[PDB]
Amino acid sequence: GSSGSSGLPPGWQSYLSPQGRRYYVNTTTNETTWERPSSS
């Protein structure tokens, strides 16, 4: 089943995989995540 994050906090960026998928990545913490901005 589908599992992600409806909305994201003001600071995280939203990118797309080289295949079509969608993922997120932090610019400050520089941490890679999956459709979920793992704030820290």
From Swiss-Prot:
Source species taxonomy: Eukaryota, Metazoa, Chordata, Craniata, Vertebrata
Part of the intact protein present: 79 to 111 of 476
Chain ranges of the WW domain: 8-39
Compartment(s) where it occurs, according to its Swiss-Prot or TrEMBL record: Cytoplasm
Job of this protein: May play a role in promoting maturation and morphological differentiation of cerebellar neurons.
Protein name (database record): Growth arrest-specific protein 7
Domain of life: Eukaryota
Disease with which this protein is associated in UniProt: A chromosomal aberration involving GAS7 is found in acute myeloid leukemia. Translocation t(11;17)(q23;p13) with KMT2A/MLL1.
